[PDB]
């Protein structure tokens, strides 16, 4: 039924309700780091991690609703329908997947803890009032 | 990168071709069963294989496109070339989907080593001329 | 000399004569199927059994006939005998090939014991009167 | 897919690229060779060496084309085409496996080392210009 | 065949275009400053490291072309040095050359897995958003 | 600046100017024998031997100004431009490359000892008079 991915990984999908949206890069950044620094084990037919696994499994659904965003511009006569579409590919299905993708690649990177630890001073950070708050924003770090 | 699918779980993309797209439960089908089965894999915070790990994402994945249906279904105009559309996520963008899911239902089910057994052996019926050939079908069993 | 194909390999072409020409698959078919499953065998540099060894000439020795085919489908003036000998070339030389493919592919896939022990069982199915026969057909498994 | 014979044994399809048209013997002397002093293994049903299975896996190739070349002297009425087959019988066609059959004798007599460090020796010969070369052509030996 | 320079370093050409054009400083920079500082070790005869190696056949093929488009500069007007000789080696071809000779200058110094590192965590910290990121790059320490 | 392209192996240019200018084969030829030869240590990520590094980034060297003479195949229309411009490349340097690319060649598979003597060799046996000189050039040694 409803599930969470980050259920396993001591997470919430609640959690990320604190990030606001632009706290996460685009997902061309997204995938082009993944694409960079960790091309070895995605491809690698011997997974060591399940970040590993969800991660591979994760980009496939990014590239499979590319090409339905490359379809609905072929065949939907509609422009206002094609917007709305293609603009909500990269609303909230896209900020979902944003969510999801930064979440590990910033465990493989860091572990799934500190990316916890982080979301943890994040939250606390944004939670503090404007006036009381430490203007320099948490940075994430191991 | 080109990440594939099907690669550290044994069979691959390539492998699957055999199986027609008619041979696939409808998704509508797929999504009880190892649910039904499996209130726990599904949604214990302490994975066992990677195989719910991966099938979460598709579940996830899955109500994404459903939830693209629940919205393209009031916030588009004309529902004509739109229900073109939703034809298009429920056959095609979901007929990958129901692959995803097939073969980690039968496979978290019966075992890994099955299900590599199994396709092998229906790929071997199905280039069998059907000038006789025998009409059996998938086994399944432990 | 007059080497003959299968000695070493267990079965001879006395015994393969049992299967009419009607159950072997075309041609099309078996350099899909072994190939798909072996993008290694079929082309690592480092031989595993002598099947696949002895597939890749068949390999080679197929497009040979289809390179012929390819050149004489238009350095040949009249297609109408032209054609004949394609059809010649498709149906009656592809033939034996088609019989080395299929040996190698299931023997390769289901060990030589296996081949060996289905090709006497089907020899008994065929030679079975079929006023009361099994509807049955090849089984295949490990 | 695309598969050379040569890569399991150190070669490559590309390397007989320097040996120029008439390196090769004929292919009547080729078998001939098999025939006489290697006549034993081959037909022999217990083979020693790789080379021993494409051998005879492939001397059953030119024995089945000429077979085809016999038919194509059968039935086609037209003189043009009937020589322009059998001359491309002879042609590249004959001309391929000429340079597999030669390989094979000359691997399984001298191994599958020295037929290499010929084919190494042989085209920096032809690679060196006509006037600085020992005009007496390297000679295989062992 | 293709070679990717870098094979052997562990960084990819894919790795490298990781980083935005920019990133890499001029051409006559990496040259003077090579040359301010390995006299020393480029023109001695005897090399240490392979990056030695490298960078001394990347200086003399980068001054074959500047001597390309010298020598273009004579030969005609519009596509000769002028219009399209200069512009595509000094822009074009350039932007290849100005991360060969960065890398090993690069390398050498902090040796190549700084140089590794500081790709990557450079080539993220260009991808964050901008509030939540220190305000200065990182810095290549040893 | 003018940094010695040989100096690491002994050599000079003298040396390479010491022997005739077309004894050197053809530009594609070398590459023919050098892929051939290395086509597995030149794609290993791995330092095989000084030889290896000089090798790859002379190939690269070489495959960028074949790049340039296929960009002035398209993108350059005059006809007296994109014909002389190759004569530089193919013709001009091309002779700067062969020297290159016939030594780390050469000295791969012999040795850097023996392809120096192999210079001195033919490079004084060209030189003593016809009338007398010995009948064959000397040849390529281990
Ligand atoms: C996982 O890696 C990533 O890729 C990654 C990272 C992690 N990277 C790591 C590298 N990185 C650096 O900056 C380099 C390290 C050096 N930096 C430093 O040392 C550094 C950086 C900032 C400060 C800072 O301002 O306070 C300080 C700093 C201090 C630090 C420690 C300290 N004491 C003693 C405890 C005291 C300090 O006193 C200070 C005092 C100052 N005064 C003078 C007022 C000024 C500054 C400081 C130090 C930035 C973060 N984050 C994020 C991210 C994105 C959005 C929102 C939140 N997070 N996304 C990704 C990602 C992106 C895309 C993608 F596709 C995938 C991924 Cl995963
Ligand atoms: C595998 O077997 C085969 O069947 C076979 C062979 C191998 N055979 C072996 C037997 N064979 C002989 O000749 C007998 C051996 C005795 N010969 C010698 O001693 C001999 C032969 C030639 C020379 C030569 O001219 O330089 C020399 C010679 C020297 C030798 C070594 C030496 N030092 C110290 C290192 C110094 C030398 O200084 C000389 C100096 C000279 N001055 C006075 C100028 C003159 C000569 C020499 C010696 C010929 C080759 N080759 C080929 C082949 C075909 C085409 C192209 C290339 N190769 N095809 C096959 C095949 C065919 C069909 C088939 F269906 C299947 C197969 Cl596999
Ligand atoms: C050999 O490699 C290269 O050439 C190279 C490098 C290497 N880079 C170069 C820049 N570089 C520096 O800048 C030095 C570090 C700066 N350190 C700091 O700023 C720093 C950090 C911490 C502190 C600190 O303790 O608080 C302090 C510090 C102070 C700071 C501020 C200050 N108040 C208030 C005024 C007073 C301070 O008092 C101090 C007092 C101290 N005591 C008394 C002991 C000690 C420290 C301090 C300074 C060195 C490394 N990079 C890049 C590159 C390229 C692209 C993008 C980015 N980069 N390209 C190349 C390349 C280019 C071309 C080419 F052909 C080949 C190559 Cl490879």
Not at 52 to 74: K, N, P, S
Request: net charge negative; glycine share 4%.
């Amino acid at each position: 039924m409803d599930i969470d991915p980050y259920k396993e990984f001591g997470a919430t999908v609640e959690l990320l309700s604190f990030l606001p949206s632009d706290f996460f890069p685009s997902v061309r950044d997204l995938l082009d780091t993944a694409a960079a620094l960790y091309r070895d084990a995605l491809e690698s037919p011997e997974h060591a991690s399940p970040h590993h696994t969800a991660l591979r499994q994760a980009i496939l659904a990014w590239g499979d609703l590319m090409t339905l965003a490359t379809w609905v511009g072929t065949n939907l006569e509609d422009p206002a329908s094609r917007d709305l579409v293609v603009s909500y590919v990269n609303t909230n299905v896209g900020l979902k997947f944003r969510q999801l993708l930064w979440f590990h690649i910033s465990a493989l990177t860091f572990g799934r803890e500190t990316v916890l630890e982080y979301l943890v001073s994040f939250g606390v950070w944004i939670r503090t009032p404007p006036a009381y708050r430490p203007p320099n924003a948490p940075i994430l770090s191991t």
